[PDB]
Amino acid sequence: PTPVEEAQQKTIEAITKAINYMAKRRIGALLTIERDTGMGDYIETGIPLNAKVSSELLINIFIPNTPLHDGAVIMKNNEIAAAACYLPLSESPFISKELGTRHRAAVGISEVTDSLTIIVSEETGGVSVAKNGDLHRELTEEALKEMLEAE
Amino acid sequence: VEEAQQKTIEAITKAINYMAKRRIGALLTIERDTGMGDYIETGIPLNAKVSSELLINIFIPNTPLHDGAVIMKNNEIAAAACYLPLSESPFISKELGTRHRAAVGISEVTDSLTIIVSEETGGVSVAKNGDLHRELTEEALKEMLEAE
Ligand SMILES: O=C(NC[C@@H]1CCCO1)NC1CCCC1
Ligand SMILES: O=C(NC[C@H]1CCCO1)NC1CCCC1
Ligand SMILES: [Mg+2]
Incomplete structure (x- = not known):
């Protein structure tokens, strides 16, 4: 594997371990990974x-x-660029009405960038991903890791 | 460079003050000329x-x-959760524990400056040259950082 590929695998492992830990403990989280649209x-x-x-x-x-x-x-490749960042809030009617600001922010940034955003619900521990204006909820650990590896 | 050093000192002192008030244990070593x-x-x-x-x-x-x-180095946080050697000095106050002994220990073998917040009292101390300077005010800590 090239160094870039090995570095990417390490980053995915770090993200998935963190997300899995937070989901189990109902620690709310909002993690956006920059792709080709600059953030x-x-x-x-x-x-x-x-x-x-x-x-x-x-x-x-x-x-x-x-x-x-x-x-x-907000992440850029293997780095955490900044924390406590603002994202725009989506007005999409396809966001479950019980969901809060973190999910609306994730969908919002996904409507204006090609980024991938992961959300951990502080209410349920459920893990979701926002991409291209769509929210995909209740992800298994395997589905999340497969989404990251594919992206 | 001078404005960057003052910004770092302000960031450190604000964090230490927050932890001291809440009695959050902390151990923060600032590398100087001895590489760590x-x-x-x-x-x-x-x-x-x-x-x-x-x-x-x-x-x-x-x-x-x-x-x-x-451990801070070249104006960045290089790493967290690092090991430091524990001092065997018999002249550290006996009520102090591992955090303070680790700060004194690294200070015995480097020219670094280490800041400690006690989880027991929220007291702020500094280890340098093998000695621990205890119960520091905000002003005293700032003076040590500026002097360093
Ligand atoms: O692009 C990299 N990691 C990407 C991660 C994978 C999962 C989310 O973002 N690393 C390269 C830049 C620094 C060395 C290689
Ligand atoms: O910020 C600091 N140095 C900045 C360097 C790199 C860019 C210009 O010079 N030193 C701080 C750490 C302890 C107290 C001050
Ligand atoms: Mg489903």
Whole structure:
């Protein structure tokens, strides 16, 4: 495998381990992965980190009642670019009415970028992904990892 | 460069103040001229920009990153949850535990400056040159960082 491919696999493993940990504990999370549409405008609304990814940092970021836990984490490749970022809120009628701001923000950014956003519900622990204006809910650990590997 | 150093000092002091008030244990070593790569390598790599918010989030109790030392280098957070050597000095106050002994320990073999927040009292101390300077005010800590 090339170094880029191995680095990508490490990042996926870090993300999936963090998301799985948060889902089990009902830790709300909002994690947007930049793709080909640049997200600089939104990255600049948060606290800059420019940090190497780890499952441990991702978890620490979203612990409730902490400085960094509200708003989105935005990733660029293997790095956490910024935390506590603003994303636009979708007005889509296909967002389940019981869902809160994190899900509406994820769908919102997915309507104006090709990014992939992962959401952990603080109510249920359910894991969802927003992509291209669609929200896919109640993902298994395997489905999430397969979505990341495919993207 | 001067504006960047002051920004980092302000970020550190704001984080330390927050933790001291809440009696959140913390251990933050600032590399100086003695390289500490061997200890940085024992932690979780971050190479992150300093912010008060990131420092606070690192040290929250019962989280992956809160046990061990944060090591700063070249104005960034190099790693978290790092190992530091424990001092065997018999002249550390006996009521103090592992965090303070680790800060003194790294200070015995490097020129680094380490900041400790006690989880028992929220007291703020600094280890340098093998000595621990205890019960620091906000102003005293700022003076040490500026002097360093
Ligand atoms: O693009 C990289 N990782 C991408 C991750 C995979 C899962 C979400 O984003 N790493 C390359 C840039 C730095 C070295 C290779
Ligand atoms: O921010 C600091 N140095 C900045 C360097 C890199 C860019 C320009 O010079 N040092 C801080 C750490 C401890 C207290 C001050
Ligand atoms: Mg379904």
